[PDB]
Amino acid sequence: TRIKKISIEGNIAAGKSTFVNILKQLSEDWEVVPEPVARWSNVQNGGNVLQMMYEKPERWSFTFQTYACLSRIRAQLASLNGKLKDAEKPVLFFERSVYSDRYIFASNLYESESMNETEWTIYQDWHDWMNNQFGQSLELDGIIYLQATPETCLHRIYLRGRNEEQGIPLEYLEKLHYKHESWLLHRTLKTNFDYLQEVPILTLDVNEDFKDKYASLVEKVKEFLSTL
Amino acid sequence: TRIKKISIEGNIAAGKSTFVNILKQLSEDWEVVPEPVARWSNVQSTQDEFEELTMSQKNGGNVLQMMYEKPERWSFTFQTYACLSRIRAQLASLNGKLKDAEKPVLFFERSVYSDRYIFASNLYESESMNETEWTIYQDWHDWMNNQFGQSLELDGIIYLQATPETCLHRIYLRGRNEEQGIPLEYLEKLHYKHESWLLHRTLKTNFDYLQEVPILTLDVNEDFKDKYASLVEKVKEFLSTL
Numbered sequence A: 001t002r003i004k005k006i007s008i009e010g011n012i013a014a015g016k017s018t019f020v021n022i023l024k025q026l027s028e029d030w031e032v033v034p035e036p037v038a039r040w041s042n043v044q045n046g047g048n049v050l051q052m053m054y055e056k057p058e059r060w061s062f063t064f065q066t067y068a069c070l071s072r073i074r075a076q077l078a079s080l081n082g083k084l085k086d087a088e089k090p091v092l093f094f095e096r097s098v099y100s101d102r103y104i105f106a107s108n109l110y111e112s113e114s115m116n117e118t119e120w121t122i123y124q125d126w127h128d129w130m131n132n133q134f135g136q137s138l139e140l141d142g143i144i145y146l147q148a149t150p151e152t153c154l155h156r157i158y159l160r161g162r163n164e165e166q167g168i169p170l171e172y173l174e175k176l177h178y179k180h181e182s183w184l185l186h187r188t189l190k191t192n193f194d195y196l197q198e199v200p201i202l203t204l205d206v207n208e209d210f211k212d213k214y215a216s217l218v219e220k221v222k223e224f225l226s227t228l
Numbered sequence B: 001t002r003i004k005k006i007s008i009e010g011n012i013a014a015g016k017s018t019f020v021n022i023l024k025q026l027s028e029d030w031e032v033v034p035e036p037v038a039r040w041s042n043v044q045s046t047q048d049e050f051e052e053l054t055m056s057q058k059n060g061g062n063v064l065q066m067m068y069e070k071p072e073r074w075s076f077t078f079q080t081y082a083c084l085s086r087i088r089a090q091l092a093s094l095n096g097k098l099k100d101a102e103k104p105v106l107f108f109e110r111s112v113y114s115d116r117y118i119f120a121s122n123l124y125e126s127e128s129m130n131e132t133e134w135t136i137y138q139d140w141h142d143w144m145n146n147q148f149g150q151s152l153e154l155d156g157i158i159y160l161q162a163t164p165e166t167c168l169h170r171i172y173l174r175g176r177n178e179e180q181g182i183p184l185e186y187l188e189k190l191h192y193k194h195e196s197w198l199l200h201r202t203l204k205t206n207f208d209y210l211q212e213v214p215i216l217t218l219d220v221n222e223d224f225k226d227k228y229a230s231l232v233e234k235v236k237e238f239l240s241t242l
């Protein structure tokens, strides 16, 4: 629990995995808990619940959200309990968080009328329980939001070519975009987690290419980190 | 861990609650963990510290009803929750009750093992859950009783045996509306699962300590008054073997 805890956020395809695997190299002392989206595509040759979800989300959304939240808690958990353990000044970068799940993705699918009155309620009961328990270990010490405007992400979704994604509309990506602003930019979304509100947030732009601004961002961290 | 843990298994209406709620009054060292069925016919997560001052906790979905009237669609959504609320309940009673007790005993209306190996797996078996839903579910279930290891390890099982016909009847007595549609073939499918787990012991779970767990089998077919004494006597006996 000496391991500092930072979760990289921002929208679908902003540049998360990219930025963080990049920042990982800055220290023999820093590690990365990526989204286990790997699993989700071939659940164990198992089925693709992420694919499933996108196609008919009125049917599969709840089933995805709980399973998504599950796998995260579970890797985040697995990574606190080894590797780094016993190291100069350990640091752990989370591709997203249980908090992104509920209050960004989940919440949004509820508005979308894809998760109903009951599912939305079961999920939050489910999510709370799980994080009055295990998530009393994954308490965020900082958030590093990476902003990127709807239309960049829409196009980065083609740069990646994840078959289960070229169907995702702009409309979708803007909703997702609103929830990040609210929570993270303005802070105009006080959750039901008392501890969140004072926790530090460092925003970085990622709309321009890794051309002539990127390496610089790294520094916005190296210092930003040990400022506590 | 000084507290012993005893689950009460058996088909809908066999009469677990009724029985065991009577059986808890015998001793002060005995307490019972109800099965949250209430909170399944009325789904409701927790309210905001301030919201709850000016706003009630209103009536919300009855997922039990949903899981029964269109299974194909609602079972994973019922399993996930029926299992959650159960573990939460049993877990709190482990850590909140029976401190000032000599030889304490906690009874469960059903185990988390019966959720997964009877209802869920039966529902999987009559394709109301798809491979995908069934995989997910056992992933989540495996992980959870991994994350607690021994905390909820049962110390013994009381199987209450009734016939499907009896049960169907006892279903009509009790009168929960969402059960008046249940046909006989259902409780049968469910009865055989209980006989496999708890009689013939032929069923392969994922927690080995289960095979070796003592199992008391009680016939609850006959109307209550007759066999009570014998059942009460078979229980206290069984209990002083653990």
Ligand SMILES: Nc1ncnc2c1ncn2[C@@H]1O[C@H](COP(=O)(O)OP(=O)(O)O)[C@@H](O)[C@H]1O
Pocket: A011, A012, A013, A014, A015, A016, A017, A018, A019, A156, A157, A158, A159, A160, A161, A206, A208, A209, A210
């Ligand atoms: N800064 C950037 N500029 C141009 N392309 C990027 C940038 N960061 C990531 N990409 C590309 O966009 C896609 C998404 O990147 P990724 O890090 O996987 O996003 P996320 O992890 O946030 O979903 C990939 O195809 C990658 O090549």
Ligand SMILES: Nc1ncnc2c1ncn2[C@@H]1O[C@H](COP(=O)(O)OP(=O)(O)O)[C@@H](O)[C@H]1O
Pocket: B010, B011, B012, B013, B014, B015, B016, B017, B018, B019, B170, B171, B173, B174, B220, B221, B222, B223, B224, B225
């Ligand atoms: N031995 C018995 N003889 C007649 N009725 C019983 C007996 N045991 C339970 N019942 C009744 O049958 C119905 C189902 O019992 P209950 O304890 O609610 O079953 P369970 O909780 O096992 O589903 C209730 O009306 C209950 O009072």
Ligand SMILES: Nc1nc(Cl)nc2c1ncn2[C@H]1C[C@H](O)[C@@H](CO)O1
Pocket: A012, A013, A035, A037, A065, A068, A069, A096, A100, A101, A102, A105, A106, A165
């Ligand atoms: N809680 C989540 N809810 C949804 Cl609907 N999707 C998620 C979630 N967490 C990660 N992803 C997925 C969506 C993108 O396709 C991919 C980008 O990282 O991750």
Ligand SMILES: Nc1nc(Cl)nc2c1ncn2[C@H]1C[C@H](O)[C@@H](CO)O1
Pocket: B012, B035, B037, B067, B078, B079, B082, B083, B114, B115, B116, B119, B120, B123, B179
């Ligand atoms: N794990 C469970 N899966 C299903 Cl499909 N149903 C259950 C479960 N546990 C209790 N019930 C229901 C059956 C009765 O209708 C009622 C009384 O237990 O609760």
